[PDB]
């Protein structure tokens, strides 16, 4: 049927969905969209089931041509001024694209990841029940390249274009995050450094984790090895160098670094919109105690 031909990708264009939960027994991480709220919205706008895959675009710059029929699309997350044959259409809104037309996302100034949804979804072959690409293990559909032809799944042309809840703007400079203290905050000489430091986000940040730099967190016992433990996205690992890492959707199932704190659920999607060079400020969700 209908396909999307990738003309240009930008820095990183991935097929993403809800991921592959419950697979730790085989060493497979959940993966999925880095900003779940934006991904879910893109799919709701085009009336897709919530399982449908979208294209997660990093720093904008993604272009695709429609072939074989008309499509309904939506772009959420970072505002890239999306256009169809040069005519802008607006982020967070359904847009009808005709056979032969070019969907083009620009470059955002605020935020990092945008989600392109298409009614019927990006119908690539699932891997371990998910169409999500896992950056670390390389499991799922390969990162998109120019020349790739993506199938659009089956759908009914008629659907209700429902009134959606307004979208909160993405933080342009300082990102404030709530952190549940622990479980290994006792490993650090002064764990409160975490919550009084202007942490800078580096260009080494990816879907495995966000790398922060600032005043290093020193260990009480620097040679102490933590037995490997299960991790989650939003967990703040502190490697021996003392520079915190906030785990992303592609984090490995287990890790060997002490976790000082874990970002609360409400603030986890904010991480998917933090650009390299931005400042992150952390705050305890509730006081820590021995």
């Amino acid at each position: 049927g209908t396909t999307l031909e990738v003309l240009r990708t930008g820095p990183l264009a991935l097929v993403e969905d809800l991921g592959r939960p419950g697979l730790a027994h085989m060493g497979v991480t959940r993966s999925g969209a880095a900003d779940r709220r934006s991904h879910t919205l893109a799919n709701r706008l085009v009336a897709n089931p919530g399982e449908s895959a979208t294209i997660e675009v990093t720093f904008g710059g993604f272009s695709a041509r429609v072939c074989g029929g008309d499509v309904a699309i939506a772009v959420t997350g970072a505002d890239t001024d999306p256009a169809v044959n040069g005519i802008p259409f607006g982020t967070n809104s359904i847009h009808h694209v005709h056979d032969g037309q070019v969907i083009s996302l620009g470059a955002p100034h605020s935020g990092l990841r945008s989600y392109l949804a298409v009614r019927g979804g990006i119908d690539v072959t699932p891997v371990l029940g998910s169409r999500s690409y896992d950056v670390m293990s390389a499991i799922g559909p390969s990162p998109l390249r120019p020349g790739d032809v993506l199938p659009v799944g089956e759908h009914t042309d008629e659907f209700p274009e429902l009134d959606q809840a307004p979208v909160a703007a993405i933080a342009e400079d300082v990102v404030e995050l709530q952190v549940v203290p622990g479980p290994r905050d006792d490993w650090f000489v002064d764990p409160d450094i975490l919550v009084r430091t202007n942490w800078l986000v580096t260009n080494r940040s990816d879907r495995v984790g966000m790398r922060l730099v600032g005043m290093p967190l020193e260990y009480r016992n620097p040679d102490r090895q933590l037995p490997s433990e299960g991790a989650t996205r939003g967990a703040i690992q502190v490697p021996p160098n003392g520079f915190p890492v906030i785990l992303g959707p592609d984090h490995p199932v287990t890790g060997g670094y002490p976790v000082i704190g874990v970002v609360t659920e409400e603030d986890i999607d904010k991480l998917g919109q933090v650009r390299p060079g931005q400042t992150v400020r952390l705050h305890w969700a509730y006081p820590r105690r021995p």
Binding site: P21, G22, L23, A24, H25, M26, G27, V28, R30, V127, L128, S137, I139, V180, G182, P183, P227, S228, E229, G230, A231, T232, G234, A235, P252, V253, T254, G255, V259, V262, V263, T264, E265, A285
Partner: protein
């Protein structure tokens, strides 16, 4: 017995602390069998169990339910019950570090192979890569430290040792473990009905070929 320390791991997960891998594997079974509401995954590891929940609302109700759970002492096992193993892995003992392991353990290469094949191992936890299983409860004489510097490339099917663990590298990758041999068994295959050959709680027997 009852649970020890139960940490809040963020607002939608719980990290249960244990003194041994055997306890981690027994409480994993207890938690799996309890079929708790809102549980997305149960992650056993070296000395802990991570219970991942669907949302913050499940945290307090899970903590309460967890308090009423009990594990039988019998479920905490260090040898296979009935000596019966789940899988047998055939290994060619031609590893790069076989002679080094011999020197470090105070054994001959013949004794190293015999110890590795003589005592079954339990898959404690998965990590590092899909299909990479950290094996425990094997011959304690084999305890050897990690390599000073990791190798750039270790082959796919490399049978190795580090600390209290044994493990099989699923694919070609960098690795700092002590290499004792190799297998032709497929550790991980995405198209296979059971993608990972080794699942936590399983008992493995190594066989020399």
């Amino acid at each position: 017995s009852t649970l020890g320390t139960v940490h809040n791991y963020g607002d939608q997960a719980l990290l249960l602390e244990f003194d041994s891998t055997a306890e981690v594997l027994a409480w994993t079974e207890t938690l799996r069998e309890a079929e708790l509401l809102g549980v997305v995954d149960i992650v056993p590891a070296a000395r802990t169990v991570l219970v991942k929940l669907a949302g913050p609302r499940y945290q307090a109700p899970t903590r309460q339910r967890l308090g009423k759970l009990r594990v039988r002492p019998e479920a905490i096992t260090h040898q296979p019950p009935g000596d019966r193993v789940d899988v047998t892995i055939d290994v060619v003992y031609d590893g790069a570090d076989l002679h080094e392991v011999a020197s470090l353990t105070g054994m001959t290469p013949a004794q190293v192979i015999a110890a590795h094949t003589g005592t079954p191992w339990r898959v404690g936890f998965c990590g590092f890569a899909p299909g990479f299983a950290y094996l425990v409860d094997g011959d304690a004489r084999l305890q050897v430290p990690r390599r000073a510097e990791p190798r750039t490339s270790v082959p796919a099917g490399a049978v190795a040792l580090a600390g209290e663990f044994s493990g099989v590298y699923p694919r070609q990758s960098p690795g700092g473990w002590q290499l004792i041999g190799h297998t032709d068994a497929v550790m991980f295959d995405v198209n296979r009905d059971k993608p990972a050959l080794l699942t936590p709680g399983m008992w493995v027997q190594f066989r020399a070929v």
